[PDB]
Design a binder for this molecule. Structure first.
Ligand SMILES: [Ca+2]
Ligand SMILES: [Ca+2]
Ligand SMILES: [Ca+2]
Ligand SMILES: [Ca+2]
Lengths: 28, 148
């Protein structure tokens, strides 16, 4: 925990991976 | 019987809000496709409606928590991944050098969100950096959630 307010980018990439994976295919 | 956990589900409750344009709590072909291209894609309405029609309960063109949970939960149910981190990083930075400057972050933020200012982005980015260089690096993201 270097700084505060990290959850942001976390959900950001999570959405990127889930959207790209869900939308297209190939889980994980 | 079995569903996502506090962390997994959490990202889900939040996703549904980030996915949609206004946060209707559900994803549609218009929202799904929108974000898709917002990053660096160019799919058709067919793949959006088709994919959604296969996961949508009533198949009206939009997914709901109940149908989404079993779908994403049955296929996924773990913390972040090395692929997601790096992949998401490749799509964030325009040069893929690993450093996401507010210019890029804000661009994607407003793209999927509503409207973001230079101060909010720089405030979110600078406050994110460990040493503060004006942008975010991989080591920053990892350290942000995990690492030391
Ligand atoms: Ca909407
Ligand atoms: Ca529906
Ligand atoms: Ca860069
Ligand atoms: Ca730095």
């Amino acid at each position: 925990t270097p700084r505060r307010g990290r959850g942001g980018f976390q959900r950001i990439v999570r959405l990127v991976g889930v959207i790209r994976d869900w939308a297209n295919k190939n889980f994980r | 019987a079995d569903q996502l956990t506090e962390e997994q589900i959490a990202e889900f409750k939040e996703a549904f809000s980030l996915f949609d344009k206004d946060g209707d709590g559900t994803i549609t072909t218009k929202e799904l496709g929108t974000v898709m291209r917002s990053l660096g894609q160019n799919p058709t309405e067919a793949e959006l409606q088709d994919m959604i029609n296969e996961v949508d309960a009533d198949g009206n063109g939009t997914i709901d928590f109940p149908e989404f949970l079993t779908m994403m939960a049955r296929k996924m149910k773990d913390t972040d991944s090395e692929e997601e981190i790096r992949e998401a990083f490749r799509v964030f930075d325009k040069d893929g050098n690993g450093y996401i400057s507010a210019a890029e972050l804000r661009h994607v933020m407003t793209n999927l969100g509503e409207k973001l200012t230079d101060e909010e982005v720089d405030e979110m980015i600078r406050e994110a950096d460990i040493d503060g260089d004006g942008q975010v690096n991989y080591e920053e993201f990892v350290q942000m959630m995990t690492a030391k």
